[PDB]
Design a protein around this ligand. Structure first.
Ligand SMILES: Cc1ncc(COP(=O)(O)O)c(CNC(C)(C)C(=O)O)c1O
Ligand SMILES: Cc1ncc(COP(=O)(O)O)c(CNC(C)(C)C(=O)O)c1O
Ligand SMILES: Cc1ncc(COP(=O)(O)O)c(CNC(C)(C)C(=O)O)c1O
Ligand SMILES: Cc1ncc(COP(=O)(O)O)c(CNC(C)(C)C(=O)O)c1O
Ligand SMILES: [K+]
Ligand SMILES: [K+]
Ligand SMILES: [K+]
Ligand SMILES: [K+]
Ligand code: NA
Ligand code: NA
Ligand code: NA
Ligand code: NA
Lengths: 431, 431, 431, 431
């Protein structure tokens, strides 16, 4: 039973609490799209852990590579090169759009954004960084100063030169022109302001192609191109954070591919490691060259460590081989439509959005007022659990509770249907 | 041969350069205190990789646990608890001094210091952070603003409220009282200044018990206690960064134990993971409690992930069982004395310092002028390699080149003698 | 002749150049609404110097008081009280709205805003300051960080916690709701953003009732009240900068009176001194009380100096006695209508705005495109001079050249007509 | 009687309290080295007001010029040149050392330092500013961030890039080499630190030749030269703040003349205006030239206003004519020796320092412990008043109470003796 009093005792006694609340169960094993409790109960992992297990839990291929290297090449002096490192660097260079040529292999999302941000500042000689007011880039320093969805308060001043602009949000529009939402005009409006406050040191813009923590907010048609150009005109880099979107999730290997806009620096993480700590940035040769010229510095313990590298490599190998990127679209379509039928039944569902297998469901009270569903979310979330479905709802100012849905690219047709089933039951029972 | 033209081609073409220079060899395998090149040549790893492989490369016990969990419990939704997590948290609570009760499990050194620093600011409501002018805490935001050994230039303003004080350096003293080096008076002097510049927002002091990147600088007798008290009087936390010192390396499980001063927050990393990415902070229940009360937030992808946790646990298990902490003193003594004999032979060696198996050798031209050996270091470093010994020299302003020596706690008597041998040959041949 | 080669030689040789260009004439004397050159030519001062000579140049009453005190009470140790100081403080308390009770007498506009801003931060314990993107508050530190009309570039980082919002600009509207300019919605929109970037330290909002340097931008009906409330809800002070508007200029003794919204802190300057350096802030007793409790500090050489105080007093005496505030409306109306007739004749005039005797004329190319008149301004400005009328045009991003018009409250009907005359001639000749 | 209940009532009711405490008297008139109360009692102004009345109160020559211009040329549009402006600019260029060629005429000390600091940052392209930990430069923004004697707390973050070094203080030395105070070594020590914290953006060093508010601290022999060189090597400007020292006070027209080191920018104020608000900066033609090239901006209401300019001119005229600079040395010597005799009598006097007519007397309990006299100061200060002598004591951390003594350069032999008399009586009566 999950009830083990010693477990919970030691948990209460020795764990630092870092946000939210611990699920009152003890997880003992994980396989495929399922995690299992101490009673053996099976929970459908509709969030891929913390949106990382792209190939699911304990993917035989992953297992082998991990053991294959665990005992052969493990961790090395940061000045030593090895095969997995170089092969991954190359692979990344070969699968990302043209213009992205060089990679640095790290360990975490924030770490990746930090390295990117640092290189941007170096290269440009400037330091002001603009982001979305609903962004999420990490808990560390620079990453955190660019994160506006949460954590800004009670911890002192942000980094000098930090600005934000509103993100384009089609569901709840706020900027109009000739009776319509003109998300571009909004962009122009926003940048004018930026311009008026800048000190003449704009160095980069950092953005997620899809605002995950922000509520599964997809940047609408033409935006990125527009953005890009806004940067171009001001001598700024465009850093795209693809932690949740990279690696096939949204139906393309990378989200920037859909839009057809390649960034100056692209960051990867969660999905690249498939649950293990691997991260990376990829940039153009020129930028790397100038960064070098100027003595760029991003020296760590785990930069260029074989084990992870090796793992990142397998994962790409399999996504490609098993054609998971396509799959994403296919199961994505399946889940999407299923989500729409629920919306057909219940009025508490106000929006179904996302792309591929990165989907969001916005709970609302009045499907015409689009009034946030107060607590209803927690309830549903809660019944999903009782029911055996792991979910995650995000709640932000002025929006309704959002269910972030993101199963494994390896998810099965049956599991999809199964989640959809439990989701409906939880809903009806939650009302 | 390490000469593989495709390897090097792809290395030149796709790797981002993050600091220093890549060793012109290809590493293919690692076992114990050795890493092997593409020709099979064996290199004695006298730096434990990037000072992490505490149990050496591919430690059978580590291997098993990694595989044992790789296929059983891998990565989880950050809200889910598991056994390895809770057991490690407990273990840490049980082996660290009294006053250290709760832990948060992360992935990297900088990440750990960031979480610590963030909690400090939260809890106190202040934001100014003091560190040593020769410090090294990480490449990310807050970690980097407190790092003064390198990387301050060309990347924009540091974090608001950043101060530094000189570290006590017995070899090259600079503060005198009644014809003698009074490192405490220096401390008092230093803090007065701080006090005069603070805005009334001092929140913490962050320090390494032994300045590794700073040149293997050990804080002298009574200092830490003094420091601690300096903080106490100003309502500041004392955060001890034990990334290179924690886990038995300096002869004690933790360096703060020797001095008999327990910090408000203690950070661990490199050594805890033994080459894998595991990190953590440990603090008092009260501080955790208040941090909670105020909504502390340090939510990441890999916080509380079973695999690493599991790995951290084994490592403690083995250090304890195999009595490596003691061993540290014993082989440490061996290596130390060996280092002294070389100093007896060559005049280029000006100091032999450190503790346990964290030793430094300061190369100097005039052993009376204590004039830095210009380039001589690089040479020796270079011959050690040709000879089959991996080394690392650090070079800072106003000091001589420093060889950071830190082999595995699992190192053998013979390997020690072997390194000492090659080290002498490299030296004599370098002159 | 203004041609004096020694004059100009020494001018070129020893003057630091601080902005714009020196008028190629030498001024020898000033009386009423006129300044005279070296040839004796009379120039109508339609800008009241640098918008200060409210009673005109060398106002007999001013002259006497200056001499009356120059030889009786001059400058004192900042701890010594005197009559003029206390009488002025009282007068200000008696003529400003209720809620404004205590005054601090300074020397300059920026100085006044700085003291206000400092007190705000003290009292609230916060430090973030919001202003208009078209604001002007001074060249010194805090004053300058809140100034967004000019000077942000090439001089390093602004003050930490500096934000700006767009000012309501009826002529060139940019925010729409149901096909209309909803300046309030704009306000709400703007503050949401602020809110998302604040670190939880908003302390005050600083605003000019009429954006003078920003292009004579008047805050539209209901705005201030709205603003005020936006602050109220966030525990922020509202600091109103009345340097150009205070002292009768816009038809009321103070501009905040019209709107019927009294600020937490009100600043005065230019007009209060009538060309001499006198400045002041006025606040509520409570705020003063708490500021005191906390040890507010604003100690200077000229704080509470009799001469200026004395001068400030006379000026109030006369504005009141001669009923200049009313007059303002009357001549204001006269000038306004005259400005409209010109607009009736020429297409280059796109807007006539302002209040009282603080008027702006926006030059535009297409009176339907509202396309800025490129250079045309400089030309007109230039012919006004040749013609004997001193003017000032301000040029900002995205707007047309703006003529700031502000004659003395003592201006005569004939002078008004005279300026209007020359203004037309300059225009027609400029085309 | 000073007792006027209405006066005090309105004082309590409408005055903002800005620091310290208001003298319980009402000043009605001021002439020469005396200010008079409401009872007619005469108070010897041993502080020249707030150290400004260099020619004393109501100096006939000053009076005339003020009236002479009050009615002829008063305040002008900042773009208009006039004779007094240009003549003063020239005069300053002619009386300051070589290398100082151009001037900008302002209104206040802080204002002057701000303009200087701003120009420094512009010209260099950097923003970090170093000052003394016992400095005083003004209450406004940048001026205040460089002020470390007081006001750093409770008002939010200082300006980004703010550093301080300890000032050389011969009386209470703290840095030793071969058993002696090596103020230069201290300098070297200090800058090393700075260097380690800078981000590579050091732009200027701002210093008072004599730390007035800091306790009358004179920079010892060779220091300034050393300082200068420290700057030179780092591409930094040296800005000398001569608000209390400029204009003959310390025995030279400017204090930088004694040392024989001319700064890159020199600021003047208090003394230049002789109680009226006039201020200025003086710099080299090159610096002005580059500042211009880059669009330096320091546009205010009172920049280049005739009245004050005119006043500044007379003052120079008289200092020169009446040979007050010499006088300074002569009466200075007189007062100095007189101060020494008191020290001969009382043990509470621990130091007599200063230069010319800018003298300090440090009160101490144990003339061997050099233990600060707790409150004794206030007492003496208090009896001086009862006795008819206005004084000022400054009290800083770790030092004894300091009497800042600075009478008018026009002071008489008898007044000097008179102050010395009362000072002794106050002392003996205070014990
Ligand atoms: C776009 C993006 N970038 C970086 C990160 C954080 O990376 P690390 O937390 O592993 O350092 C997230 C976070 N993911 C969390 C856990 C915050 C989530 O909300 O799912 C992210 O969304
Ligand atoms: C005390 C201390 N704390 C944190 C870190 C960095 O942790 P990560 O680089 O893994 O984020 C080091 C660095 N170690 C490096 C690689 C910089 C080294 O110099 O050995 C460190 O010394
Ligand atoms: C609202 C407001 N507040 C303060 C000030 C500046 O005061 P000081 O320049 O006298 O320090 C102005 C400026 N007036 C100038 C000269 C900038 C102008 O544009 O007319 C101002 O407009
Ligand atoms: C060196 C120096 N520089 C600037 C200033 C301030 O100028 P303002 O206060 O007139 O703006 C002082 C201050 N004088 C005060 C009143 C603070 C004093 O302590 O005497 C100063 O000492
Ligand atoms: K490594
Ligand atoms: K996790
Ligand atoms: K005064
Ligand atoms: K002027
Ligand atoms: Na590519
Ligand atoms: Na413990
Ligand atoms: Na009132
Ligand atoms: Na000169």
């Amino acid at each position: 039973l999950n009830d083990d009093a010693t477990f919970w005792r030691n948990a209460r006694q020795h764990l630092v609490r870092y946000g939210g609340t611990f699920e009152p169960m003890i997880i003992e094993r994980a396989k495929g799209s399922f995690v299992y409790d101490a009673d053996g109960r099976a929970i459908l992992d509709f969030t891929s852990g913390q949106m990382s297990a792209v190939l699911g839990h304990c993917h035989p291929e992953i297992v082998s590579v991990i053991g294959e290297y665990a005992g052969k090449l493990d961790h090395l002096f940061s000045g030593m090169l090895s095969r997995p490192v170089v092969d991954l660097a190359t692979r990344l260079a070969n699968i990302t759009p043209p213009g992205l040529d060089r990679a640095l292999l790290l360990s975490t999302g924030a770490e990746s954004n930090e390295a990117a941000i640092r290189m941007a500042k170096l290269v440009t000689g400037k330091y002001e960084i603009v982001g979305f007011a609903q962004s999420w880039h990490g808990m560390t320093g620079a990453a955190a100063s660019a994160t506006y969805s949460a954590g800004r308060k009670g911890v002192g001043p942000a980094a000098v030169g930090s600005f934000a602009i509103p993100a384009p949000f089609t569901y709840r529009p706020r900027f109009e022109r000739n009776g319509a939402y003109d998300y571009l005009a909004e962009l122009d409006y926003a940048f004018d302001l930026i311009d008026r406050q800048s000190s003449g040191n704009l160095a980069a813009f950092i953005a997620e192609p899809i605002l995950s923590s922000g509520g599964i907010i997809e940047l609408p048609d033409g935006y990125m191109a527009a953005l890009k150009r806004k940067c171009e005109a001001r001598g700024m880099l465009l850093i795209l954070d693809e932690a949740q979107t990279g690696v096939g999730r949204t139906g393309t290997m990378f989200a920037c591919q859909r839009d057809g806009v390649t960034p100056d620096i692209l960051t990867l993480s969660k999905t690249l490691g498939a649950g293990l700590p691997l991260a990376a940035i990829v940039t153009s040769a020129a930028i790397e060259e100038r960064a070098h010229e100027l003595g760029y510095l991003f020296y760590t313990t785990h930069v260029s460590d074989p084990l992870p590298a090796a793992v990142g490599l397998r994962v790409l190998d399999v996504v490609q081989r098993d054609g998971l990127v396509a799959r994403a679209n296919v199961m994505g379509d399946r889940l999407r439509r299923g989500l729409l039928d629920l919306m057909e039944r219940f009025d508490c569902i106000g929006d179904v959005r996302g792309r591929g297998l990165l989907l969001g469901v916005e709970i609302v009270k009045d499907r015409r007022t689009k009034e946030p569903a107060d607590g209803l979310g927690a309830k549903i979330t809660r019944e999903c659990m009782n029911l055996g479905l792991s979910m995650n709802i995000v709640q932000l100012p002025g929006m309704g509770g959002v269910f972030r849905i993101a199963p494994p690219l390896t998810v099965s047709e049956d599991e999809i249907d199964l989640g959809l089933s439990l989701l409906g039951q939880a809903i009806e029972r939650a009302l």
